[PDB]
Amino acid sequence: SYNYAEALQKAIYFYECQQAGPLPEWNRVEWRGDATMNDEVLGGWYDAGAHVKFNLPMAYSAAMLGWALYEYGDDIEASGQRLHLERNLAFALDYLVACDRGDSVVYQIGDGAADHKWWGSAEVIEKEMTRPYFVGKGSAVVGQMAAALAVGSIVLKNDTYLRYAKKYFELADATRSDSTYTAANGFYSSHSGFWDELLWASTWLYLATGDRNYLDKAESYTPKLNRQNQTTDIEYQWAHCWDDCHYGAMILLARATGKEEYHKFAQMHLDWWTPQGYNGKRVAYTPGGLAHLDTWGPLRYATTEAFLAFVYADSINDPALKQKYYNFAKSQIDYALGSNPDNRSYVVGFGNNPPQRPHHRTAHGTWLDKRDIPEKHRHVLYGALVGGPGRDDSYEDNIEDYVKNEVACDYNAGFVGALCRLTAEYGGTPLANFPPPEQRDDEFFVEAAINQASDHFTEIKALLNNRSSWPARLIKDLSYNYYMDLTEVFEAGYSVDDIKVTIGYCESGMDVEISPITHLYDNIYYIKISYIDGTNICPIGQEQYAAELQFRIAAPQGTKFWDPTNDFSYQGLTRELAKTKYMPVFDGATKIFGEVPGG
Amino acid sequence: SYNYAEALQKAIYFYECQQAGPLPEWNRVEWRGDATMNDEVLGGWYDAGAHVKFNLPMAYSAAMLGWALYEYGDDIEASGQRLHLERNLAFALDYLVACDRGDSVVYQIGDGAADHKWWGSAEVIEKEMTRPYFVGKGSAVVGQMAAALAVGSIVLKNDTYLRYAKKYFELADATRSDSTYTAANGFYSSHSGFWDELLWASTWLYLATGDRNYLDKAESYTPKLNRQNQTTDIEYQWAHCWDDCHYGAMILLARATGKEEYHKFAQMHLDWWTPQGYNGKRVAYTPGGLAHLDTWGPLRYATTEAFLAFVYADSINDPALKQKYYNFAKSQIDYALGSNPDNRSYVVGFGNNPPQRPHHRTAHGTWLDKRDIPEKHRHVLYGALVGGPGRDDSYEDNIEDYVKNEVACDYNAGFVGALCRLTAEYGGTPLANFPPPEQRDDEFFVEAAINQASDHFTEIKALLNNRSSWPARLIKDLSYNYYMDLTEVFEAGYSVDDIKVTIGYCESGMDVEISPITHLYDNIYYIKISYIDGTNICPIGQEQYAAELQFRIAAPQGTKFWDPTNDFSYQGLTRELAKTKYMPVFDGATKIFGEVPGG
Numbered sequence A, B: 001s002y003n004y005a006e007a008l009q010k011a012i013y014f015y016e017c018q019q020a021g022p023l024p025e026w027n028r029v030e031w032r033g034d035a036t037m038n039d040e041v042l043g044g045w046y047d048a049g050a051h052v053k054f055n056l057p058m059a060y061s062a063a064m065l066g067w068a069l070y071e072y073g074d075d076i077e078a079s080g081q082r083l084h085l086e087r088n089l090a091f092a093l094d095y096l097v098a099c100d101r102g103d104s105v106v107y108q109i110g111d112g113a114a115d116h117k118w119w120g121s122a123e124v125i126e127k128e129m130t131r132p133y134f135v136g137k138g139s140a141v142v143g144q145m146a147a148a149l150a151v152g153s154i155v156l157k158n159d160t161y162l163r164y165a166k167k168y169f170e171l172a173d174a175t176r177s178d179s180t181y182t183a184a185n186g187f188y189s190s191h192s193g194f195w196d197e198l199l200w201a202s203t204w205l206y207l208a209t210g211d212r213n214y215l216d217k218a219e220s221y222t223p224k225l226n227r228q229n230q231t232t233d234i235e236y237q238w239a240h241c242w243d244d245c246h247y248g249a250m251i252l253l254a255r256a257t258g259k260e261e262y263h264k265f266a267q268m269h270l271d272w273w274t275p276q277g278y279n280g281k282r283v284a285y286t287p288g289g290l291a292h293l294d295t296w297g298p299l300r301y302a303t304t305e306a307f308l309a310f311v312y313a314d315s316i317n318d319p320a321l322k323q324k325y326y327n328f329a330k331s332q333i334d335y336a337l338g339s340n341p342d343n344r345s346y347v348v349g350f351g352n353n354p355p356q357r358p359h360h361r362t363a364h365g366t367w368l369d370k371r372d373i374p375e376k377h378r379h380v381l382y383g384a385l386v387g388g389p390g391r392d393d394s395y396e397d398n399i400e401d402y403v404k405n406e407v408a409c410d411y412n413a414g415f416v417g418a419l420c421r422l423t424a425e426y427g428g429t430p431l432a433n434f435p436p437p438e439q440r441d442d443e444f445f446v447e448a449a450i451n452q453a454s455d456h457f458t459e460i461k462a463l464l465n466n467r468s469s470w471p472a473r474l475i476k477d478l479s480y481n482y483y484m485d486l487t488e489v490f491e492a493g494y495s496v497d498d499i500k501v502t503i504g505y506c507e508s509g510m511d512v513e514i515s516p517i518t519h520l521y522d523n524i525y526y527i528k529i530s531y532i533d534g535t536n537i538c539p540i541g542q543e544q545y546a547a548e549l550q551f552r553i554a555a556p557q558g559t560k561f562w563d564p565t566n567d568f569s570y571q572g573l574t575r576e577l578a579k580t581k582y583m584p585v586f587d588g589a590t591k592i593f594g595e596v597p598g599g
């Protein structure tokens, strides 16, 4: 129906947009650079539309990418995406390994409140705030880290991941408590508890090792799982998700053991998600045909269940059930790609009328800590599955809607799996030369205005701007030149020594020097304005994106020769601030913007 | 009793405190300089405790000082004050002449509401605001100007004053309307109308010329005067004052014409003011014996009536009346001088426990547009009669009390005349060597703080202050120096070339230049900070009284030799802003504050 190969290609590329520094050489995102290089643990993914590293959903997402490869990695050769999927996985797993502290792990980098309060690009966030890290041993987060490393060890043939998988499982199983998992509270609190993570990690360890001691562990955890309301059945009326992976583990155990109890659970759970329901009970459906579990990330939940339904259907022989689950699964993915009442894609940069304003700071590319400016995103977040529509299929593409336009690692994870399965069946051709280059704006530039013009002076208001975004970046050795023609000064019988440079306003905190009037050639001279720590000019807020200086260049009082109209840097200036190419900007000795006399 | 000659001396000096620029050579007030030099009409008096020129009370006050001279000028020779009084009068009369615009006059300089919103000294007001002027032909204001110039012409034997008196009277009498008199509304609105001013002006023109046409005019106005309540009597239950001079005019006519009607009015009016009253009707009196006409300026009203009572009593023969009126007059003046329930003078700088916080901006001498700082006035407003106590004799000396502690040209005007009468009778000797010099504070100076000290730099926050007050004034060519000892630099093997000056903040609107590091002698070097238009540093408000600059003097990053502890200008500095004598201030090449290295 869709080009699933293209959807997969983009859905994978999304994770490169989420990478924290240092970026691998294979990163394909021209608007990302090395960011958060002062973090206690480097690499990993930023979780969602901001810059916190949250280990629970990050590891969940990595585990799901591993599961996609485990089930369908051989099957996706036509798409050309297998290696992109493997490398993206490896990048997150390396971070999970790097979080090891022995009796504990680093489970979070970033304070959620401070990080989310600020709206700007990853590469400059250290100018705005210092980022704390958090250490603990919560069974849920450590157990999910274990599971991710366990499946990763299989699909990447990597003994180090396996060793760390085992270690993390042992720590999570020794601890049996989420009491040390505090830093994600309210963002990714442990809602279901940690027994489901122990089940999920031990199941994957069994599949990784063939060691029946892990199978025995897995099976011993099923009585500790949460019940469905006040009944004796294991909870089944929810989705496999970052908080709770027992749904997928039961499916794995049904295939691995053949046991009736796991198949019974799998069919009860999946039937509840299908339009046909389970004995009269069913997930909410929108009139447009989307299984709508909850307000937050409904597309995430439905697309993850699509992956589970595909895996389960592929593992059984019954033609009626296989069809029912396959149809359900394909219907939810197709909804996400455009088969919905609005006939629109919910995947950024894919298909018809995709969302253009995802709630994502770095894709937006602002310079002033505002969501509403720029009014269009400067970068394409290719492949991001958004939160999606409400229960009545309603949706509007609005950066302010942090529900419907949210994007996240975990939103994309199960989705990638299901796309792997669909491209495996239907083929499709990935885009060549993906991604294409973006149209860029000017990034470092002077805006200037004539503050005052006199028969003996020119007074300039100049704002040296850093609105960088391809990628956002910091430059310490920033300067700009103001060029003059002193022909009239010399003709009038005066000299350079009769021309005085003064300052009428220098913005607080922007340490600045102004050179003497300096000969270029012929009668062309200039002053250079240099910022000692130009990194303080940065797109982090309304005060900080530009440094303001008012300078005056004056002939003596009572003279009337001064002529700015032959001055190179005066050309086109008005009383209103405007970008000018004739006050060129330098990084050290190198011109990075504008024009130079005769050059 | 009191030294009335000294009281008179001071009461006249008050007017020199009120003079607008350009000041005459004979002005004796060290804390007054040429102010409001851009005014449409120069000279004249500021009205009260601010900087508006209001012509109605200005002209009324000048007419009253004229009247004092007309009655008692030959009688005050022993006080030594005659020429002081005559010159002070002439200064106001010259302004009234300079107001001429042919078919109209300038009747006000400054906007009441705009001027009064600001608290600071006269000499710096043009840095705070641009002052308007107002032209019109209001019969009351033009008529009062005519009267002042008419009596002025007699006592100063000046034909120019008389010429203008006739011109102004003709304009006022032809106009017969206050409709073009609007700019003083709410401050000096015409309450009584203009018929009393035409009566006052024509009476004085009659006395100046002996032309019967003016007497005929005067007599023709009396039926147009306001009535007492719903009777047919001319209004008598008020004071001679800036708004209504028919009381004094009727006294003058009584004496000029000998008519029974005018004597009857005078005795009715004056009786109402005496403690015995007029047939059961009487002005309110405080328990302490002060005639208390209204909340505003009760001392002003009672002392003006004292002068009228003296004049009337001196012009009649009946010994019962003479004594009643004299006793009334003397008791009111003596109350003002100290014969009251507090035994205190209500005349600034005179007698026992006089007021120390009159509501007067320029005498206060602030630098930051506040009444509470400084907590003591910087200057002595000698001779000013304050508003006075409340109806129950209560009073506290408080700058916030714009009623009890108000001072004004018209408060002093009748008062001077009554003091002339009492000194004529009792003599007294004026103070030799009056006024004595005031103790001064530092006016121009740096306050500095160590903003940051590093092992390779000194960073200074410096505020160049203008808290001038003797007089408040503006200095264009301001600079200060920061002196260092570079001995440690040379000993480490470095040179002056290796020390770099940068700016971290320079206050908006303060055009500044910083010199290169400049050799003084031996290993002593300095930088000069120069403000090109230093007049923008001025005591007009919290922002403008000092210019703030943050400058850094740095050895190379990483070096370890920098030693500010041997630097002349670093001595005594802390992290807290404080005045320092070691960053000396210059006006041009002249040192005006602080010390230099070498003695």
Ligand SMILES: OC[C@H]1O[C@@H](O[C@H]2[C@H](O)[C@@H](O)[C@H](O[C@H]3[C@H](O)[C@@H](O)[C@H](O)O[C@@H]3CO)O[C@@H]2CO)[C@H](O)[C@@H](O)[C@@H]1O
Residues within 6 Å of the ligand: A186, A187, A188, A189, A191, A192, A226, A235, A238, A241, A242, A243, A244, A296, A297
């Ligand atoms: O009680 C019903 C089920 O709750 C499931 O936990 C969910 C929480 O109830 C829900 O608040 C939470 O929402 C997240 C959301 O998933 C995430 O995208 C967003 O950024 O933050 C929200 C607040 O954390 O989701 C979890 C997981 O779906 C339990 O897992 C389940 O056992 C229980 O039946």
Ligand SMILES: OC[C@H]1O[C@@H](O[C@H]2[C@H](O)[C@@H](O)[C@H](O[C@H]3[C@H](O)[C@@H](O)[C@H](O)O[C@@H]3CO)O[C@@H]2CO)[C@H](O)[C@@H](O)[C@@H]1O
Residues within 6 Å of the ligand: B186, B187, B188, B189, B191, B192, B226, B235, B237, B238, B241, B242, B243, B244, B296, B297
């Ligand atoms: O109505 C009674 C009498 O009024 C007199 O006018 C006075 C006003 O009523 C009074 O409001 C005004 O008060 C001034 C005050 O003199 C001045 O010092 C202060 O700064 O401002 C106040 C508001 O303008 O004073 C006038 C004059 O005394 C009439 O003159 C009189 O005919 C009438 O009987």
Ligand SMILES: [Br-]
Residues within 6 Å of the ligand: A104, A135, A136, A137, A180
């Ligand atoms: Br811990």
Ligand SMILES: [Br-]
Residues within 6 Å of the ligand: A373, A374, A375, A376
């Ligand atoms: Br925009």
Ligand SMILES: [Br-]
Residues within 6 Å of the ligand: B046, B047, B048, B049, B050, B051, B052
């Ligand atoms: Br005033």
Ligand SMILES: [Br-]
Residues within 6 Å of the ligand: B373, B374, B375, B376
């Ligand atoms: Br004080």
Ligand SMILES: [Br-]
Residues within 6 Å of the ligand: B492, B559, B560, B561
């Ligand atoms: Br050193």
Ligand SMILES: [Ca+2]
Residues within 6 Å of the ligand: A140, A190, A191, A192, A193, A194, A195, A196, A197, A243, A244, A245
């Ligand atoms: Ca859980």
Ligand SMILES: [Ca+2]
Residues within 6 Å of the ligand: A484, A485, A486, A487, A488, A562, A563, A564, A565, A566, A567
């Ligand atoms: Ca030129």
Ligand SMILES: [Ca+2]
Residues within 6 Å of the ligand: B140, B190, B191, B192, B193, B194, B195, B196, B197, B243, B244, B245
């Ligand atoms: Ca009047």
Ligand SMILES: [Ca+2]
Residues within 6 Å of the ligand: B484, B485, B486, B487, B488, B562, B563, B564, B565, B566, B567
């Ligand atoms: Ca030194």
Ligand SMILES: [Cl-]
Residues within 6 Å of the ligand: A046, A047, A048, A049, A050, A051, A052, A053
């Ligand atoms: Cl985030």
Ligand SMILES: [Cl-]
Residues within 6 Å of the ligand: A185, A186, A187, A189
């Ligand atoms: Cl919560």
Ligand SMILES: [Cl-]
Residues within 6 Å of the ligand: A348, A349, A355, A356, A357, A377, A379, A380, A381
């Ligand atoms: Cl986009």
Ligand SMILES: [Cl-]
Residues within 6 Å of the ligand: A431, A432, A433, A434, A435, A436
């Ligand atoms: Cl493309």
Ligand SMILES: [Cl-]
Residues within 6 Å of the ligand: A594, A595, A596, A599
């Ligand atoms: Cl060029």
